Amino acid sequence: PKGNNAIPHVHQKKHWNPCSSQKGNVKVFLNQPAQKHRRRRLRLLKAKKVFPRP
Amino acid sequence: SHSVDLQWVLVRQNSRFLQKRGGIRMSNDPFNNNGNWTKRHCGFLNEKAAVVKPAKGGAICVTVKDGSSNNKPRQTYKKTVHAAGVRASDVSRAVAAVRPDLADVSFRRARRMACIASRTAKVAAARKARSEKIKFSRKSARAKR
Amino acid sequence: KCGSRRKARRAHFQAPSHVRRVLMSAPLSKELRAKYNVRAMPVRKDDEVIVKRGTFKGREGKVTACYRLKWVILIDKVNREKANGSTVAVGIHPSNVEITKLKLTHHRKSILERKDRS
């Protein structure tokens, strides 16, 4: 039965999911902490390089 | 600050003293006169506690938690009888000073400790004679200093 | 250290010959440790070693081969007979022996100078 639910519009119709036949179209964020650490290390390195300029 | 009620609610299902083996829930708490896993018998938990233990020889020892120094684990428990040949009722009255609700079980435990000491004497003598009959190709001697 | 068992074991079992030479080291005796202040040393052909572990424990002899492909050293004194009664060397891991006498070439003394802890 369907019952009383919201009318769904989830918009997942396009080949977004990678599988045996599809490359997929996805973006995960698993590298988020490593990229945060890299950005901070890079800022520290650039501050070291351009000392004493702000 | 934190009552025995709350601590019992916290540790009842899960505790290093709860021994749930087969379907039986026993306790290996040193201050439990029974081995039963109940709030009454949890000597490690209760504010005041007393446990009957055996001592060297035929002596019977009573360990008492008086609740005055529960924040100091080294001072928390005090040895108070360590006497040999005491009446089981005397141990029972020593225990009842802190916990009257533990009187019967501690009396029975005093009697059981006495029985165990005499039985151990008999078994040890028999084993000693049996040993005296045997050659015993090896014997270990602990180093002394 | 090496967070991976897989990689550590691969680097050990696929090691090159000079790395295997380093991996196949044996402790020095108390006297040699005192003389050189070096704890252990890679085993070399014509070293004198006494066995400390295994069935040949206590046996003293001279090193005749550091095989390095079988991870064993061959000692002239430790051996056994085949079915036909001839003799065959028995390989021992160098970590089970102790060097009592070093073969000293000039470069060996140089190595010992490099490893002097004082």
């Binding site: 009383n4 639910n5 919201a6 009318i7 519009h9 | - | -």
Partner: protein, 49 residues
Amino acid sequence: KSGRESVRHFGASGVPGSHSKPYATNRGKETKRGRRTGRSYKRKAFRHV
């Protein structure tokens, strides 16, 4: 508890005399046939019990 959003959403909103809110993410959707006299019909605001 009678002012709760779940209470406000209970029951079919398209039956006569019902004033429950529908489960809809888009407020502007669902404002047509079934809710206006000029769009086919309008659900009746009142029905005698």
